[PDB]
Amino acid sequence: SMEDKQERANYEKLQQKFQMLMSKHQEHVRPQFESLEKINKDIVGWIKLSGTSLNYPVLQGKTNHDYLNLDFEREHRRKGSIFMDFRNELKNLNHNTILYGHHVGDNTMFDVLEDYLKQSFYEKHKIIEFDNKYGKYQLQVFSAYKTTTKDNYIRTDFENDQDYQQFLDETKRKSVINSDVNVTVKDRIMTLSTCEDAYSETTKRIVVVAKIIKVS
Amino acid sequence: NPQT
Numbered sequence: 001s002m003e004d005k006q007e008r009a010n011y012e013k014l015q016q017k018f019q020m021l022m023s024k025h026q027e028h029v030r031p032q033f034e035s036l037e038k039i040n041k042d043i044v045g046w047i048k049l050s051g052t053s054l055n056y057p058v059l060q061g062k063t064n065h066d067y068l069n070l071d072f073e074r075e076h077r078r079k080g081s082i083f084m085d086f087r088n089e090l091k092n093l094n095h096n097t098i099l100y101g102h103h104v105g106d107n108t109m110f111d112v113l114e115d116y117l118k119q120s121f122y123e124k125h126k127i128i129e130f131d132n133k134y135g136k137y138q139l140q141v142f143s144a145y146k147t148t149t150k151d152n153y154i155r156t157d158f159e160n161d162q163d164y165q166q167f168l169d170e171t172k173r174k175s176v177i178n179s180d181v182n183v184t185v186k187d188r189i190m191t192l193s194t195c196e197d198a199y200s201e202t203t204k205r206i207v208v209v210a211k212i213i214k215v216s
Numbered sequence: 217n218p219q220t
Contacts, residue, residue: 063219065219
């Protein structure tokens with residue numbers, strides 16, 4: 001209750017601040033993030049799916065565990081943050097940008113990814129909003145599947161187009177959902193993956209892959 | 217494998 005309600009309140013407050021910032025800077029996006037960086041310089045983006053609980057800042061540390069158990073204000077929270085892989089850049093995007101988040105089943109963080117394993121849900125939520133200092137983007141979902149940690153869906157960059165094409169085709173092959181989105185080697189992708197606590201018994205992960213489109 |  002003290003954790004829960006307070007945590008929830010703080011997210012509501014930040015969500016509201018970001019919606020105000022968006023409405024204020026109608027064309028731009030850099031001022032919105034410069035403002036959010038005052039709270040935490042590690043806030044690199046924002047992810048939002050309308051009608052769902054996915055409406056969070058995106059953190060990035062030096063490692064993939066910096067924000068595993070820490071929130072946007074660097075406070076200890078079991079559910080931590082939605083965070084980007086430490087290897088990824090935002091100025092000039094890598095071929096595959098990876099975001100991680102908890103899935104504890106209380107309809108928060110990346111609990112939503114589990115819903116994408118259903119065709120009906122996918123059809124009603126094909127586009128996810130992603131914003132950063134460099135632009136406003138759409139995440140055009142094309143693949144959703146459950147895997148293990150024995151499978152590398154985490155690949156950030158490729159040796160050539162053939163390697164990248166292999167990856168894209170494998171991604172579509174693994175998909176539990178049918179999509180009309182066309183993804184080529186000239187495109188950049190975003191991987192959304194569930195993230196478990198350190199040294200957890202659970203090896204299963206839910207992965208949602210999307211094509212990045214710049215809307216700004 | 218990194219932390220996922």
